[PDB]
């Protein structure tokens, strides 16, 4: 009770316990769906002027 108590001694207050951890498991939400992608000929368009016909 008197000399068997769990004090925080320097070394146990070390900044690595907060710094080497990420915030990512705390800030990301589960998303569970596909990301967007498309070709240039679709998003931009066909160059219609540069052609024979």
């Amino acid at each position: 009770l008197l000399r068997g108590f769990e004090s925080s001694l320097r070394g146990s207050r070390v900044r690595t316990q907060i710094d080497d951890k990420s915030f990512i498991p705390y800030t990301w939400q589960m998303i569970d769906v596909p990301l967007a992608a498309a070709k240039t000929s679709f998003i931009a368009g066909l160059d219609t002027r540069q052609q024979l016909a």
């Binding site: 498309a38 368009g45 066909l46 160059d47 002027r49």
Partner: protein
Amino acid sequence: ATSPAAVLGNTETVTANTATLLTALNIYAKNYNVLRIMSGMGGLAYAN
């Protein structure tokens, strides 16, 4: 421009001296294009 007898009493090839204020020329064209949309994404068919 200040004499309506001269503005309302003249021919096809002339107008009023105050006409020189129409300094801005605006040329418009209305065209066709195609908006293609697939798989939740969209964009124009023709670019030029």
